[PDB]
Amino acid sequence: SMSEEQVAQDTEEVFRSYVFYRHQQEQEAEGVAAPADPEMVTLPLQPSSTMGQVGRQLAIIGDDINRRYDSEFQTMLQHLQPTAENAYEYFTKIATSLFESGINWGRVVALLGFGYRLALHVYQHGLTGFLGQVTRFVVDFMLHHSIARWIAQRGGWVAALNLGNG
Amino acid sequence: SMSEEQVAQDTEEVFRSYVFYRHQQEQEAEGVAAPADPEMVTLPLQPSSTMGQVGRQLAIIGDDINRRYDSEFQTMLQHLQPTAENAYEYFTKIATSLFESGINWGRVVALLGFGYRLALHVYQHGLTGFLGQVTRFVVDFMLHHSIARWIAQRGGWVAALNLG
């Protein structure tokens, strides 16, 4: 009852929910000192939908891991200098590189995390409305580069619902 | 009144306590990636040391900021490839560059953090007993590059207890 096409469709809500909950938890953290992105706060979302729950699961589990990459990603994205015009192709080639040596659920989540960091960086540097562009980078990569089919063979995004709760 | 010599002497317990309590809290982190360093787990400390208090406090209040640099320092130290043979040279170049454009308390604490990260690297690449060498790297640089004097003129290491 799952297909690659269905997984790709579902990915938009998964990613938008991931963005919402990741931003919310980082804005709530105590040390933080991180400027809010209002585009991520006012995302229209249905929290109890299944894809909403998947995005939340992936945002909240092990978030201490992505903290260890914060300063490096500031440096790297400053060197990348993403723009509205160059970001799709950079995203696609970075994602291809990421999965070259294999696909696993953690790398799938890392791709969502990169979408989040890229969206936040580009907003903070003055471009509004870019979240819709990054959302399609993520969906279209998964559709056209094996990831959506990989997820579909494993049951769809619902297979990620409980990752990290043993 | 507080001298640069007293600050230099105090710095050893500050740094050793800083290393112990930083390692303790980092090893408690969810998803921690660095393996445990038994030299820091079993590191003995003086129980009632005011300077021990200072090092503990600096480790604690620096945790949020310091961990955000973890992956970048892994990358950078893999590139530097420090060893026992070149550690003094590179520590001195790095510490000199750190303070070239000015001294401030955050940079003072970052020197401690660098000593910690260098000690971890060297142990994890196979060399035991190096913690005493880095400890002296830190103390000697502070004494001879006016950092101990700077701290002394602001009240000594206990002045750091007012941070945060």
């Binding site: - | 900021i65 130290l77 510490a95 560059s97 020197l111």
Partner: peptide
């Protein structure tokens, strides 16, 4: 290439300065 010790010192400085700005007096 920037020498590795220079890159490390630059990021040590950034880290320290972040601490310094966060834990400023009053």
């Amino acid at each position: 290439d920037m020498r590795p010790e220079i890159w490390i010192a630059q990021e040590l400085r950034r880290x320290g300065d972040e601490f310094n700005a966060y834990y400023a007096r009053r």
